[PDB]
Design a protein around this ligand. Structure first.
Ligand SMILES: *[C@@H]1O[C@H](CO)[C@@H](O)[C@H](O)[C@H]1NC(C)=O
Ligand SMILES: *[C@@H]1O[C@H](CO)[C@@H](O)[C@H](O)[C@H]1NC(C)=O
Ligand SMILES: *[C@@H]1O[C@H](CO)[C@@H](O)[C@H](O)[C@H]1NC(C)=O
Ligand SMILES: *[C@@H]1O[C@H](CO)[C@@H](O)[C@H](O)[C@H]1NC(C)=O
Ligand SMILES: *[C@@H]1O[C@H](CO)[C@@H](O)[C@H](O)[C@H]1NC(C)=O
Ligand SMILES: *[C@@H]1O[C@H](CO)[C@@H](O)[C@H](O)[C@H]1NC(C)=O
Ligand SMILES: *[C@@H]1O[C@H](CO)[C@@H](O)[C@H](O)[C@H]1NC(C)=O
Lengths: 234, 333, 48, 28, 48
């Protein structure tokens, strides 16, 4: 790793979310019914933080107050994985999610990173320098202007880490898109901060532009409508 | 005397509480269809899960560092949890300690530690004291069991044992199921203790020093707490019940993975999707179920029922009656 | 409609359904929950 | 009649759910 | 007047005031006392 002093100070953009961040809160089927729920949701018409990556490097460290709504507008799969933790060293457990070429790997244990971790067509995978014994490991099928919109919701409650996901082909747009549950993990950690991961390749050369949005969840009461099938339409 | 189940006139007399019935139309009762068979459906898991080493362990941890173990995806057997010792305490809250062999749970949690003899009563919902607010705290909606047994012959030693410790001084009461391992010094006074002992600077750990000689109410006790969560889930863990082939299009009583009922099971057309297990209706009752051995969806419909009325003239005139079945097409009585 | 919707109340019992109450507790103890449920439902129907 | 037809037209799965709880409607 | 006066009756509990009930004794019986008070007050409202 190297140290550089060429960064330019610029606050991230602020945008608004209209009707995004609605996910199925229970594992039960309902058809053509109006229901009321009280859970951790994303408030409607709420400001969210917008980062743009193309040079300029923007991988800050952000809190994990109660939950995270992470959205990515992108093409050619630059955003790769996620790091979650409390102190981000070998003194506390850290959760790590990386999308392989044709798989996804999730693991929770100690690790070691630089002050500005990054990822180096992929031939070399060097994000962490050391790794001690790990408690939970998991391998699964891959999760997969700008032409791809990926929405994810990360929660941690009742000693379980919940990942909800949704994908869509298309300054967020209008409309309604429910999020189906994807993974539950029995981890049980402290979790306070997190940081994203993007892929960069050395290469005239054109760099794909990507944008990602971060929003925070709060406890709220919602009234959901289920149509003839088990689809949330409003 | 009158027999209330011989003919409709007798049933009308028995309902009206009289030996004479006058002209009119009377509503007697309802008719149902009784079940004929019985089926039980449980998952095909056959392996066992660790219970021997949880109880037959060499060293249990201290109170402030209580040992936690997660139990899932097995078949639980509780018969072996009888001959632990000649006498032991076994108290279950939310369940009865005789019926937990035919119940299906989501996840099992086992917490193990060792406690002073007379503090066993303090491991209970909503109790205050020394260890229930500084060492181990339980919620007020607990659903589980608590087991405690004597450990004099194994734990106490003549030479002196000081490997068991508790905590006495803390700022605020612990959140339920929360652990603390801090050793930072207490600050009763107004000046810093600079990490050294002194007045108003007390080390927040203490020892037991068990010896074979103390009274019956002071020897160490071994305590294990089992926590369940009876909700809707894939039902990873539950006990030894034999399965049976399922029947369709016949009013039978069923036990699907712990849900008991009576009715008729039919092939379903609902558009379930991977994570959906069962379904509900307008009145918040179960309507569809998923068989945990074939991954197919079935619909539940209670078998036929209705109301019966009796039309008769006065008993003074004749003993002939007519029967009216309400709201049914009597090609399908 | 409201008479139908009243059936999901607990009235201080441990569950809103009867079969799980009868399949989890011994006869000495299930009586209190059954009594609570029965009294609540009777009151609702009488009010109707 | 015409006015009676207009009046009749003017005034107009839940039934099964209610019936499965034991509430029925009788005809005049 | 009778609706207001109904607020100061025990309905079979230790006391009418509920904070004293909460402070004096443990949750296991405090739940029963609270249930008694709630049922009594709801019945009074229904009658009114
Ligand atoms: C979000 O924050 C920005 C500045 O932090 C503010 O201008 C904007 O009004 C906020 N959004 C809402 C909906 O208030
Ligand atoms: C999957 O990712 C892990 C990262 O820990 C790596 O060690 C492994 O080699 C990868 N597997 C493949 C097939 O790329
Ligand atoms: C991991 O290693 C550390 C140090 O070697 C040890 O204290 C700890 O018990 C180990 N954990 C597991 C699960 O093996
Ligand atoms: C998580 O880590 C922070 C960092 O010190 C700490 O203040 C906090 O107490 C930890 N969480 C819990 C539940 O102890
Ligand atoms: C339910 O799914 C069917 C496909 O089987 C579809 O034709 C229908 O439009 C869906 N209902 C909606 C979207 O309300
Ligand atoms: C267990 O699973 C296998 C594979 O799906 C299935 O064929 C079998 O029937 C299951 N066990 C029982 C008792 O049905
Ligand atoms: C512990 O050891 C005894 C010794 O015979 C054995 O009978 C028992 O099954 C073991 N496990 C438990 C949980 O008691």
């Amino acid at each position: 790793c190297v140290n550089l002093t060429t960064r330019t100070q610029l606050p991230p953009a602020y945008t608004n979310s209209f009707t995004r961040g609605v996910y199925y809160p229970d594992k039960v089927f309902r058809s053509s019914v109006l229901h009321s729920t009280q859970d951790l949701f994303l408030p409607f018409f709420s400001n969210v933080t917008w980062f743009h990556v193309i040079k300029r490097f923007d991988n800050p460290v952000l809190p994990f107050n109660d939950g995270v709504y992470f959205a990515s507008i992108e093409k050619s799969n630059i955003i790769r994985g996620w790091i979650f933790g409390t102190t981000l060293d070998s003194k506390t457990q850290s959760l790590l999610i990386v999308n392989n070429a044709t798989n996804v790997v999730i693991k929770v244990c100690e690790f070691q990173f630089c002050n500005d971790p990054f990822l180096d067509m992929e031939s070399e995978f060097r994000v962490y320098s050391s790794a001690n014994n790990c408690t939970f490991e998991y391998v699964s099928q891959p999760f997969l202007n700008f032409k791809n919109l990926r929405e994810f919701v990360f929660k941690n409650i009742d000693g379980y880490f919940k990942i909800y996901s949704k994908h869509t082909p298309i300054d967020l747009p209008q409309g309604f898109s429910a999020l189906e549950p994807l993974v539950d993990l029995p981890i049980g950690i402290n979790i306070t901060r997190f940081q994203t991961l993007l892929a960069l390749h050395r290469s005239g050369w054109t760099a794909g532009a990507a944008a990602y949005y971060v929003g925070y969840l709060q406890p709220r009461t919602f009234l959901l409508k289920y149509n003839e099938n088990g689809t949330i339409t409003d | 005397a009158v027999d209330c189940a011989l003919d409709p006139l007798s049933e009308t007399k028995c309902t009206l509480k009289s030996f004479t019935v006058e002209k009119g139309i009377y509503q007697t009762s309802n008719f149902r269809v009784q079940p004929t068979e019985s089926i039980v459906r449980f998952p095909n898991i056959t392996n066992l899960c660790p219970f021997d080493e949880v109880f037959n362990a060499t060293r249990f941890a201290s109170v402030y560092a209580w040992n936690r173990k997660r139990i899932s995806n097995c078949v639980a057997d509780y018969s072996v949890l009888y001959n632990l010792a000649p006498f032991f305490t076994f108290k279950c809250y939310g369940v009865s300690p005789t019926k937990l062999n035919d119940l299906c749970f989501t996840n099992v949690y086992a917490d193990s530690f060792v406690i002073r003899g007379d503090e066993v009563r303090q491991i209970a919902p909503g109790q205050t004291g020394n260890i229930a607010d500084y060492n181990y705290k339980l919620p007020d909606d607990f659903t589980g069991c608590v087991i405690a047994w004597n450990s004099n012959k194994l734990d106490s030693k003549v030479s002196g044992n000081y490997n068991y410790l508790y905590r006495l001084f803390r700022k605020s009461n612990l959140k339920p199921f929360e652990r603390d391992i801090s050793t930072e010094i207490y600050q009763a006074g107004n000046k810093p203790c600079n990490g050294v002992a002194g007045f108003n600077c007390y080390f927040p750990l203490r020892s037991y020093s068990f010896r074979p000689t103390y009274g019956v109410g002071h020897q160490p006790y071994r305590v294990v707490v089992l926590s369940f969560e009876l909700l809707h889930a894939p039902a990873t863990v539950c006990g030894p019940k034999k399965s049976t082939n399922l029947v369709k299009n016949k009013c039978v009583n069923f036990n699907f993975n712990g849900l008991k009922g009576t009715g008729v099971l039919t092939e379903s057309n609902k558009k379930f999707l991977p994570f959906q297990q069962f379904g509900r209706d307008i009145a918040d009752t179960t309507d569809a179920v998923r068989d945990p051995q074939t991954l197919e969806i079935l619909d539940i419909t209670p078998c036929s029922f209705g109301g019966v009325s009796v039309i008769t003239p006065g008993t003074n005139t004749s003993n002939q009656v007519a029967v009216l079945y309400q709201g049914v097409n009597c090609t399908e009585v | 409609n409201t008479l139908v919707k009243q059936l999901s109340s607990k009235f201080g019992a441990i569950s809103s359904v009867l079969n799980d109450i009868f399949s989890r507790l011994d006869p000495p103890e299930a009586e209190v929950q059954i009594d609570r449920l029965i009294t609540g439902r009777l009151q609702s129907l009488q009010t109707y | 009649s015409f006015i009676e037809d207009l009046l009749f037209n003017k005034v107009t799965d839940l039934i099964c759910a209610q019936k499965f709880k034991g509430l029925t409607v009788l005809p005049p």
